[PDB]
């Protein structure tokens, strides 16, 4: 299991996930499903994600990120969770 | 399991899979219809089977 952050809990709860603990797949599932259904991806650049002004930006500390940076995505996630 | 266009992702769905979000899976030969129907962290591929 993993331990999410209390900021992220507010986003998760908006996707139905009101629990304080979830699985590794679930954390990224609720996140992915949210952006996918929100339309927060560029049509021309579906590999770029806007975190600026969303709850993801608040916790990442960056205005935008690239999905291409898998090694960065994992470090951002592991800084949110407890190993 | 997390299986997309690992040769050239041109879509959000494709690049989402490449992240392997979940980790490794035992690659079950169970027939699914979605990633939620498959346990652990496995995703349903375009054949309806986990990978």
Q: Which residues of A44-62 are buried (b: 16+ CB within 10 A; e: fewer)?
A: eebbebbbeebbbeebbee
Q: CA nearest A68: which of B30, B9, B35?
A: B9
DSSP state of A34: H
Task: Give the whole-angstrom CA distance, residue B18 versus residue A71.
Answer: 11
Question: CB of A48 within 8 A of CB of A67?
Answer: yes
What is the sign of the dihedral through the CA atoms of A36, A73, A77 and B20? positive
Q: Where along chain B do its domains lie?
A: 1-51
The nearest CA of chain B is from the CA of A5 a distance in Å of 18
**Residue A75 CA neighbour count, 13 Å, CB half:** 5
Query: What count of CB pairs under 8 Å joins A to B?
Result: 38
Question: CB of A78 within 8 A of CB of A60?
Answer: no
Task: Give the whole-angstrom CA distance, residue A34 versus residue A12.
Answer: 9
Topology of the domain comprising B1-51: R-elafin (4.10.75)
Chain A residues touching residue B21 (CB < 8 angstroms): 24-25, 28-29, 32
Residues 11-50 of B with CB under 8 A from A: 11-12, 15-16, 18-23, 35-36, 40-41
Beta carbons of B15 and A47 less than 8 Å apart: yes
CATH number of the domain residue A8 falls in: 1.10.245.10
Structure determined by: NMR
Task: Give the whole-angstrom CA distance, residue B38 versus residue B45.
Answer: 11
């Amino acid at each position: 299991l993993v331990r999410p952050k209390p900021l992220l809990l507010k986003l998760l709860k908006s996707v139905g996930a009101q629990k304080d603990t979830y699985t590794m797949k679930e954390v990224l599932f609720y996140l992915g499903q949210y952006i996918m259904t929100k339309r927060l991806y560029d049509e021309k650049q579906q590999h770029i994600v806007y975190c600026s002004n969303d709850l993801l930006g608040d916790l990442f500390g960056v205005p935008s990120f690239s999905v291409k940076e898998h090694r960065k995505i994992y470090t951002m996630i592991y800084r949110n969770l407890v190993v | 399991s997390g299986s997309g266009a690992s040769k050239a992702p041109t879509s959000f769905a494709e690049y989402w899979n490449l992240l392997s979000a979940g980790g490794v899976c035992p690659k079950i030969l169970q027939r699914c219809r979605r990633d939620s129907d498959c346990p652990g962290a496995c995703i349903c591929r375009g054949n309806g089977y986990c990978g």
